[PDB]
Design a binder for this molecule. Structure first.
Ligand SMILES: CCCCCCCCCCCCCCCCCC(=O)OC[C@H](COP(=O)(O)OCCN)OC(=O)CCCCCCCCCCCCCCCCC
Ligand SMILES: NC(=O)C1=CN([C@@H]2O[C@H](COP(=O)(O)OP(=O)(O)OC[C@H]3O[C@@H](n4cnc5c(N)ncnc54)[C@H](OP(=O)(O)O)[C@@H]3O)[C@@H](O)[C@H]2O)C=CC1
Ligand SMILES: CCCCCCCCCCC[C@H](O)CC(=O)SCCNC(=O)CCNC(=O)[C@H](O)C(C)(C)COP(=O)(O)O
Ligand code: SF4
Ligand code: SF4
Ligand code: SF4
Ligand SMILES: [Zn+2]
Lengths: 339, 172, 42, 385, 145, 83, 84, 116, 114, 198, 112
């Protein structure tokens, strides 16, 4: 049944079963929507509470999506999820380090275990998602850790696809938003005033379409990829683009990363969810990456979508009424960088 | 025959102003609702005293089985040719005894309308429509009944079905 | 045999309205009010 | 003016309506009701379904009146076949038709009140409606969309205890009506909310095709149960409750009277129901009895063909109207010689009534419109079909 | 015919025999219409079938059990209006109202006999002849059915 | 495996369905229950089989138990009758 | 079954006799398991009793004007209750 | 009034049929053939216009037959070749008319089988 | 042959209506984007309008063009008013639908249907 | 099992049918009283307002109420749609059917002037079958979706349409989608091949 | 006399005998311009005449009503006034003419 037997759409089948582990958060809800609209079964392992997995139940058709509970501490949950799949996708990743899990676990130990069972179960593809510009000694606890794992993944389950996306924008993101949120607290306290650091941002759908195409693309095997996105923007300009599109006053008062590092520490202390933290602060200001030679969305078949276009949808909320109705051509025009 | 529905001495004029000023006529309604808090509520204790039904009550389908143990369904297709919601697919074979039985039977209980056109068409009394009505489900897949969720279903209520069939067979 | 009206008819049901006219009269009504309302003044 | 789209979800009316309104300050300048929110395609689907397997489409057109909708179709299919139901069946259809008029009116009078704001009348009557459902469940098997008044008769005989239980309900129901009667008929608040609201003049009512209590409330004399009798209504005696001053109140009072007049008709049906069989028994039209199909070959063949293929009614077309509780419900059934119909235009008393909302609710405030929809007894299944 | 029955007596039964692996003769169904006997003798020249006995136990089956082996054999199914002898492979896989009928051409043999392929829910359930005066006039081969 | 097969092949991805779940499968196969029944001996050449009931059983067909060689089997009950 | 005082409370407040017309079914209800019933069932040739074939294809068709049918007789007020 | 026009009355743009179901789809006007299984000739008298047969596949969950051809269950019934070709041309579909096949007259005599 | 006119007599006369609709729509697209908080750009939408008014650009039977205008105008009414929500209007953009390939090799490679 | 019927009606109504045919010879093409005892005056489409006005306002034939307006679509006929208007006379307790024929591209007049009941029914006939009513106030879709393309009750429209709806998270809107049905609707070819003797 | 004609709109008309005579007499004239032998003129003049014949033969309203076999006279008028409007409208539509166009072939054969 890897023979797709139907007109494309729900109720067809493209015959690729898949275990998409991080399908409770931000990126996986789009992956299930594409894998799903592609009518492929998706065994979605959820450790969450069912009330929060419902939003996934309609992104599929009768029987397409199957759910089962998995906790990273114990295997056999990883084993049974990947037992009947042929595709496996890893989207596990947390910004903060909850008392129970370290960047160690969510980025190395776990993906390793999943991939372990993946190879053990015979799944052909272990699409894994590590961050762009994320290598060892990248001076950020997570990014460094993330790359360490990329190796563990490769070692155990070779011939694996590894996507390393740039910052991911799109609704419900924590990229544009973190910057947008600054409105609430004072003004944007951008380090380097936001200059001197450039970020390539890619829409969630562009990454999601890429992961789906990769699961079904033969040449993709053993191929790393970088989903950079269409334009490289300096941080100060992008925060200014978030503002104006947010329609709230902008003030890029500077300060050193070390202060903001000490600062976020406290925000991280927040028990529920850090509003920001040292690791995040770092990956924003210092983190900057120039892709050089990796296939990318175009290669995998996606036309990266510029941020100039789909920014209404993710910032139209952050406007006060009386500005909500503001259209796009009105939005403060942005500009791209090379650096 | 037709009936009209809506068609001054001081005695009458004072009476009108005694029913407009010292309202006396909204009082005949307040005493009317006071007449009901003192009566016995009709509410039944629901989970413990389920309401009354009839042997005719049409609910969850089930496939009856001959007392011997032989499925009664002989795959006529006299019950999807009438099922107006177009809910039943009963692909069949010779069962390798030489006999005639289903390999497939189906209701999509999210399309059925509990009309009982399948229990009155069946010339053998195989498919019935039982007196269940507590079979709600948290998912969509638990309503697409197969021949084994209808046959063991009918291997459940047969003590409770046959009493109602035997109770209504004459009227049918 | 077959459900059929009880021999001799079911009996008579009443259908017409019975909202029963009743009540104190106006002259009397008011006179208790004012009588209760002069006493409140004395 | 101000375009406030009355809520499609709004608790008022039957919750399947939009009713874009122009608010000239407090009053409503114009109404443009946007129905279609429940058009399931009933008339399209019937063309693909045999005559028996389409009866169900009908009890689901005006779900408040179940068995009267069916009684139309059943009368229409019978006329096309030139067969008539047996005598007992005709009385049973009149018995069940009057129980449906009581239940539609309990629906219309009590739900109008909760829209107005009176909440208790609904609860007292709805317990009286559950008693009546039980009568449908104890004759058909369902409490709703029974599919009991089929072509040629009723599907099955009345159970051995139904007529005694209908007497006990009808015996005590009359007190329940005037209990609502004392609650709403004389109240200052109800009369002010209902009297002189949505007056419709007699000629305008005929021109707008109102054809219902809306027609009789304005004083026009027409019932369709005494003008063009169907079944055995010609043998039962009742008084049409016409009214003057065509205003919501007069229309309410008429609906309360028809509940009372229906108890008079139910009284006659229990007193005079004939011994006999419930379905015409030429097996070509109505299916053979369970014992006969299992012992005689002609009956097995007739059961197999009727359930699998159909009656195959002779080619022709008919418009048959019966007085459904809402108003004249008619089916224009066009039939080729085939077992499945060619067209089935369900005339819905309600498509005409809702059209009248803009004319009837003119010079009226937002609150009056809630009463105007309530007094048309419109359920959107019939309008949307 | 008639709405009811007046036969309050006992029915008859004949004994199912084996005429081959293609024709299932549940001949208690037979209305002794002798179409089978004729076809077997006038279209297919195989005069193996015949009537045996007189009265109400005239049974139209081979006196000795010799299979009806000939091409043109399956046509008996199509030609017996009763379902006494019907097709054994297509015994109980379907029921005709459901079968969607697409008119096509025989490719098994070069006579190119016209045929109707009866398909249900997307798999072919039976191929039965459709009439072409010149090529196959209502008959198809045992192979192409 | 159901009385009619259906058993999913180990590789079939159509097996996830039953994970954290199970499979509705009737243990009472009618192929065997009917075989666990005594061949109904009879005296007459032909016999009826109303399905052990009048109007509560299956259409009434007369079976020809005429050859001991074969126990007639009503096509509806699968009951073998021993002449 | 209610304390007489409480029920006289409901009869006086309602204004209507209330023990008679109960909305609750105590013994009023027919008991279930009604005894089994026996429902009631020459020259009965279907060709004589053919409703289906009896119908015919539609007929296609100084002088005095003719109304569609004689004018409807006007009804008369009800004898029991002319006005309510 | 009475303007004159010269088109085949293509209402393809008033119909509302998605292009791909008005372009790549062939109607097949034909008078249905008899069910060899029966000898009734009442189902071989009116010309039908049925459309092409596209994919009928299997629902992975229950094994039912699924389809994406909206115009699959469509069998318009006309009363003459002329009136079917007209409708197809009217709606912009491609047609494949098939001439009727009435049995020719075959002479039958009872006595003939008694000759020797 | 002779045919009664629906509203216009000659194709030219009718086109007068076709243009009186184009203008209307064009002058409306801007309004809709803002009113229905749509996200597509004025230019983008106005493109769609031309596309449609263009899609029908081959019929010569006045009666048909007399009829598509009407249907056309009706669609404005709804859109001019907000009788249509965002969902309705945005449906003209096949946002989710994956455009079907046309190349033979592109179809042969997927789906038995032509 | 043979309807209890009155021959008085067949005759009385037949006579009215000749009356209407005599009074309006220019528009009535055929008048026939069916055996169901109902009357049908078939009028040329141009006679829609003249024929219905005569019936609404004539002392010997007052047909005040419009019971319904519907359009059977026989695809074979050149003029497919057969608009049918059923009217009721409260005064004479009788009912009449006036039916005229309209093609896809030839509109018929609107009787909203004669009966205001038709304002809604005519909108439904346009939405369902596509017949257009001339000088009709506010003709626009009554029953179909705001963006619906195609006229649904036409015999040439697929039962289940071409578009369906679903909520797509990626776009957060209810998006349409070409119709894919999980179980095609088994079309049963149930129709006997032995015709009934008339 | 009569306090209220039942129907809501129709209001009691005093001088029923008079209003009618005028409306009926006007009509008897508008029919005049109709072609000599036009069913409408031949039939509507047969009716209007009988009603004018009774409108003047009997002077008691309630009585008159029974004779005209209409509803309240306030209705016999409503109708007399509408026929006049049809009579005016008919003289323009000239219904008496020969049929406009015979149905296309087979446009009225139901078992198609
Ligand atoms: C001569 C001696 C010297 C002079 C003494 C003084 C002169 C004589 C005074 C006589 C006073 C008579 C009563 C006047 C006060 C009562 C209120 C009133 O005047 O009625 C107004 C209104 C009438 O309603 P309606 O019929 O619409 O009349 C207007 C018509 N356009 O009424 C209403 O409709 C209001 C209805 C609102 C809803 C009421 C619901 C029932 C409430 C029941 C309350 C029960 C408890 C009341 C007591 C509480 C005590 C704390
Ligand atoms: N812009 C971006 O977001 C970018 C992301 N990436 C990478 O892509 C991946 C997906 O990102 P995104 O989805 O936004 O990250 P999220 O914060 O949304 O987390 C992804 C999913 O992983 C699950 N998860 C998190 N921690 C654990 C744990 N300890 N055990 C089990 N499950 C867990 C979460 O579910 P639950 O709620 O149950 O914890 C969540 O649904 C990440 O791993 C990240 O490294 C790379 C570049 C940019
Ligand atoms: C954003 C919402 C999208 C809604 C778009 C709009 O409402 C839908 C619509 O275009 S409504 C149908 C328009 N369709 C016509 O109006 C007929 C055109 N008629 C021709 O095109 C002729 O062939 C002609 C000879 C004129 C060619 O000449 P030309 O190429 O136009 O110049
Ligand atoms: S259930 Fe009854 S009807 Fe449906 S197939 Fe089995 S036997 Fe025939
Ligand atoms: S009940 Fe009606 S709908 Fe449900 S299955 Fe039996 S027949 Fe089909
Ligand atoms: S043809 Fe069929 S029925 Fe006629 S005899 Fe041969 S077998 Fe018996
Ligand atoms: Zn048996």
């Amino acid at each position: 049944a890897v023979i797709p037997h139907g007109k494309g759409g729900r109720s067809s089948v493209s015959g690729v079963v898949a275990t998409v582990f991080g399908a409770t958060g931000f990126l996986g809800r789009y992956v299930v929507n594409h894998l799903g609209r592609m009518g492929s079964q998706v065994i979605i392992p959820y450790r969450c509470d069912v009330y929060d997995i419902m939003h996934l139940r309609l992104m599929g058709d009768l029987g397409q999506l199957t759910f089962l509970e998995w906790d990273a501490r114990d295997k056999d949950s990883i084993r049974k999820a990947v037992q009947h799949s042929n595709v496996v996708i890893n989207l596990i990743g947390r910004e903060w380090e909850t008392r129970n899990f370290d960047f160690e676990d969510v980025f190395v130990n776990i993906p390793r275990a999943i991939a372990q069972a993946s190879k053990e179960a015979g799944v052909e593809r272990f699409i894994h998602v590590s961050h762009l510009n994320a290598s060892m000694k990248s001076s950020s606890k997570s990014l460094r850790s993330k790359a360490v794992g990329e190796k563990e993944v490769r070692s155990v389950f070779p011939e694996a696809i590894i996507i390393r996306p740039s910052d991911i924008f799109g609704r419900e993101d924590r990229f544009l938003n973190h910057f947008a949120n600054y409105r609430w607290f004072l003004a944007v306290p951008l380090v380097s005033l936001g200059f001197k650091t450039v970020k390539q941002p890619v829409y969630v759908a562009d990454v999601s379409k890429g992961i789906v195409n990769a699961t079904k693309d033969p040449d993709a095997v053993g191929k790393t990829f970088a989903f950079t996105g269409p334009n490289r923007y300096l941080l100060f300009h992008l925060v200014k683009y978030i503002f104006g599109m947010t329609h709230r006053t902008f003030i890029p008062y500077p300060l050193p990363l070390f202060v903001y590092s000490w600062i976020g520490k406290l925000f991280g202390l927040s028990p529920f969810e850090p509003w920001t933290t040292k690791d995040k602060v770092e990956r924003i200001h210092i983190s900057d990456v120039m892709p050089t030679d990796l296939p990318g969305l175009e290669d995998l078949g996606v036309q990266p979508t510029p941020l100039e276009l789909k920014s209404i949808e993710v910032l139209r909320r952050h406007r006060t009424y009386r500005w909500l109705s503001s259209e796009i051509e009105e939005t403060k025009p942005a500009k791209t960088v090379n650096y | 025959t037709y009936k009209y529905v809506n068609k001054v001495d001081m005695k009458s004029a004072t009476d009108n102003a005694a029913r407009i000023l010292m309202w006396t006529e909204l009082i005949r309604g307040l005493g009317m609702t006071l007449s009901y808090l003192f009566r016995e509520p009709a509410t039944i204790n629901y989970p413990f005293e389920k309401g009354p039904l009839s042997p005719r009550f049409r609910g969850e389908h089930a496939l009856r089985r001959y007392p011997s143990g032989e499925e009664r369904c002989i795959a006529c297709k006299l019950c999807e040719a009438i099922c107006p919601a177009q809910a039943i697919t009963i692909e069949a074979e010779p069962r390798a005894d030489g006999s005639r039985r289903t390999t497939r039977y189906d209701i999509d209980m999210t399309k059925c309308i509990y009309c009982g056109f399948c229990q009155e068409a069946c010339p053998v009394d195989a498919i019935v429509e039982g007196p269940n009505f507590e079979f709600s489900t948290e998912t969509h897949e638990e309503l697409l009944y197969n021949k084994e969720k209808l046959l063991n279903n009918g291997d459940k209520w047969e003590a409770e079905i046959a009493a109602n069939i035997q109770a209504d067979y004459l009227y049918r | 045999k077959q459900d059929m009206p009880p021999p001799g008819g079911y009996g008579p049901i009443d259908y017409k309205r019975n909202l029963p006219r009743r009540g104190l009269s106006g002259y009397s009504m008011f006179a208790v009010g004012i009588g209760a309302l002069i006493f409140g003044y004395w | 003016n101000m375009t406030l789209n009355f809520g499609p979800q709004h608790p008022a009316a039957h919750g399947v309506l939009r009713l874009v309104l122009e608010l000239s300050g407090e009053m409503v300048r114009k109404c443009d009701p946007h129905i279609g929110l429940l058009h399931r395609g009933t008339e399209k689907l019937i063309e693909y379904k045999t005559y028996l397997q389409a009866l169900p489409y009908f009890d689901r057109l005006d779900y408040v009146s179940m068995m009267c909708n069916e009684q139309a179709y059943s009368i229409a299919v019978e006329k096309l076949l030139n067969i008539q139901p047996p005598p007992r069946a005709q009385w049973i259809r009149v018995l069940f038709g009057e129980i449906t008029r009581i239940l539609n009116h309990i629906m219309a009078v009590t739900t109008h009140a909760l829209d107005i704001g009176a909440m208790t009348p609904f609860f007292w009557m709805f317990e009286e409606r559950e008693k009546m459902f039980e009568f449908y469940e104890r004759v058909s098997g369902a409490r709703m969309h029974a599919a009991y008044i089929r072509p040629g008769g009723v599907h099955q005989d009345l159970p051995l205890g139904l007529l005694d239980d209908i007497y006990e309900f009808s015996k005590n129901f009359s007190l329940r009506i005037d209990e609502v009667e004392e609650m709403l008929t004389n109240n200052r608040i109800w009369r002010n909310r209902t009297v002189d609201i949505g007056v419709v003049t007699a000629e305008d009512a005929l021109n707008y095709g109102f054809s219902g209590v809306m027609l009789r409330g304005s004083g026009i004399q027409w019932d369709l149960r005494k003008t063009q009798p169907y079944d055995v209504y010609d043998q039962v005696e009742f008084d049409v409750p016409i009214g003057s001053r065509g205003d919501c109140y007069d229309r309410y009072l008429c609906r309360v009277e028809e509940m009372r007049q229906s108890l008079r008709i139910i009284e006659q049906c229990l007193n005079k129901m004939p011994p006999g069989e419930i379905k015409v028994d030429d097996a070509k039209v109505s299916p053979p009895k369970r014992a006969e199909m299992k012992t005689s070959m002609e009956s097995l063949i007739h059961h197999f063909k009727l359930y699998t293929e159909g009656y195959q009614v002779p080619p022709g077309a008919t418009y048959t109207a019966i007085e459904a509780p809402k108003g004249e419900f008619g089916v224009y059934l066009v039939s080729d010689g085939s077992s499945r119909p060619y067209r089935c235009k369900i005339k819905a008393p309600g498509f005409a009534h809702l059209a009248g909302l803009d004319k009837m609710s003119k010079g009226h405030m937002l609150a009056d419109v809630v009463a105007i929809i309530g007094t048309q007894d419109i359920v959107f299944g019939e309008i949307d079909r | 015919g008639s709405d009811r029955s007046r036969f309050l007596e006992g029915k008859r039964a004949v004994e199912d025999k084996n005429i081959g692996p293609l024709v299932k003769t549940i001949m208690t169904r037979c209305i002794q219409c002798t179409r089978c006997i004729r076809f077997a003798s006038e279209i297919a020249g195989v005069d193996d079938l015949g009537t045996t006995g007189r009265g109400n136990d005239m049974q139209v089956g081979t006196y000795i059990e010799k299979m009806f082996m000939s091409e043109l054999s399956g046509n008996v199914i199509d030609i017996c209006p009763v379902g006494a002898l019907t097709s054994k492979p297509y015994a109980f896989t379907a029921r005709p109202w459901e079968t969607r009928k697409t008119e096509s051409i025989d490719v098994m043999d070069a006579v190119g006999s016209n045929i109707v392929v009866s398909t249900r829910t997307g798999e072919v359930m039976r191929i039965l002849p459709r009439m072409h005066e010149d090529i196959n006039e209502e008959w198809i081969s045992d192979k192409t059915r | 495996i159901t009385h009619t097969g259906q058993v999913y092949d180990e590789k079939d991805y159509r097996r996830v369905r039953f994970v954290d779940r199970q499979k509705e499968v009737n243990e009472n196969f009618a192929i065997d229950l009917i075989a666990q029944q005594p061949v109904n001996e009879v005296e007459h050449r032909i016999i009826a089989c109303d399905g052990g009931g009048g109007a509560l059983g299956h259409p009434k067909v007369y079976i020809n138990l005429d050859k001991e060689t074969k126990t007639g089997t009503c096509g509806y009950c699968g009951l073998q009758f021993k002449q | 079954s209610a304390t007489r005082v409480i029920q006289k409370l409901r009869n006086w407040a309602s204004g209507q006799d209330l023990q008679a017309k109960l909305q609750l079914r105590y013994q009023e209800i027919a008991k279930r398991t009604q005894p089994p019933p026996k429902l009631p069932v020459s020259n009965n040739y279907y060709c004589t009793r053919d409703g289906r074939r009896e119908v015919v294809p539609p007929s296609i068709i100084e002088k005095k004007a003719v109304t569609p049918a004689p004018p409807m007789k006007r009804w008369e007020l009800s004898k029991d209750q002319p006005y309510l | 009034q009475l303007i004159t026009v010269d088109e085949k009355l293509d209402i393809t743009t008033l119909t509302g049929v998605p292009e791909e179901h008005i372009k790549t789809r062939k109607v097949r006007i034909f008078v249905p053939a008899r069910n060899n299984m029966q000898s009734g000739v009442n189902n071989t008298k009116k010309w039908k216009m049925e459309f092409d047969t596209r994919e009928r596949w299997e629902n992975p969950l229950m094994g039912w037959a699924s389809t994406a051809d909206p115009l699959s269950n469509m069998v318009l019934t006309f009363s003459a070749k002329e009136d079917a070709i007209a409708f197809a041309e009217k709606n912009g579909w491609s047609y494949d008319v098939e001439e009727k096949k009435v049995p020719k007259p075959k002479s039958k005599s009872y006595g003939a089988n008694f000759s020797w | 042959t002779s045919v009664k006119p629906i509203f216009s007599r000659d194709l030219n006369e009718a086109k007068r209506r076709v243009r009186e609709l184009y203008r209307a729509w064009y002058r409306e697209v801007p309004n809709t984007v803002h009113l229905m908080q749509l996200d597509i750009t004025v230019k983008q939408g106005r493109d769609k309008v031309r596309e449609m008014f263009m899609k029908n650009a081959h019929v010569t039977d006045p009666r048909v063009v007399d009829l598509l205008v009407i249907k056309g105008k009706m669609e404005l009414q709804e859109t001019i008013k907000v009788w249509k929500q965002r969902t309705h209007v945005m449906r003209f953009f096949h946002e989710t639908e994956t455009p079907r390939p046309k190349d033979f090799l592109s179809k042969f490679y997927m789906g038995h249907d032509p | 099992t043979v309807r209890p019927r009155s021959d008085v009606t067949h005759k009385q109504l037949s006579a009215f049918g000749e009356y209407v045919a005599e009074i309006l010879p220019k528009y009535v093409q055929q008048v026939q009283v069916s055996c169901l005892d109902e009357l049908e005056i078939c009028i040329h489409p141009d006679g829609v307002i003249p024929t219905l006005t005569f019936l609404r306002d004539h002392t010997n034939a007052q047909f005040k109420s419009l019971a319904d307006l519907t359009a059977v679509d026989v695809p074979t006929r050149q003029n497919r749609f057969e608009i049918v208007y059923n009217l009721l006379s409260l005064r004479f307790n009788s009912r009449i059917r006036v039916k005229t024929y309209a093609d896809e591209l030839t509109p018929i007049d609107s009787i909203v002037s004669v009966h205001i009941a038709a304002n809604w029914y005519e909108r439904e006939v346009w939405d369902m079958f596509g017949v257009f009513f001339f000088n009709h106030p506010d003709l626009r879709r009554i029953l179909t979706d705001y963006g619906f393309e195609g006229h649904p009750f036409r015999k040439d429209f697929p039962l289940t349409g071409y578009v369906e709806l679903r909520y797509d998270d990626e776009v957060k809107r209810v998006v349409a989608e070409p119709v894919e049905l999980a179980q095609e609707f088994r079309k049963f070819d149930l129709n006997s091949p032995w015709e009934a003797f008339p | 006399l009569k306090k209220t004609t039942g129907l809501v709109g129709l209001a009691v008309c005093d001088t029923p005998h008079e209003r009618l005579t005028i409306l009926y007499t006007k009509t008897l004239d508008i029919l005049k311009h109709f072609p000599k032998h036009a069913a409408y003129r031949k039939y509507t003049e047969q009716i209007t005449n009988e009603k004018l014949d009774m409108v003047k033969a009997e002077p008691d309203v309630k009585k008159l009503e029974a004779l005209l076999q209409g509803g309240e006279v306030e209705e016999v008028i409503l109708q007399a006034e509408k026929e006049l409007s049809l009579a005016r409208k008919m003289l323009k539509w000239k219904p008496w003419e020969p049929l406009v166009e015979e149905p296309p072939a087979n446009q009225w054969k139901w078992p198609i």
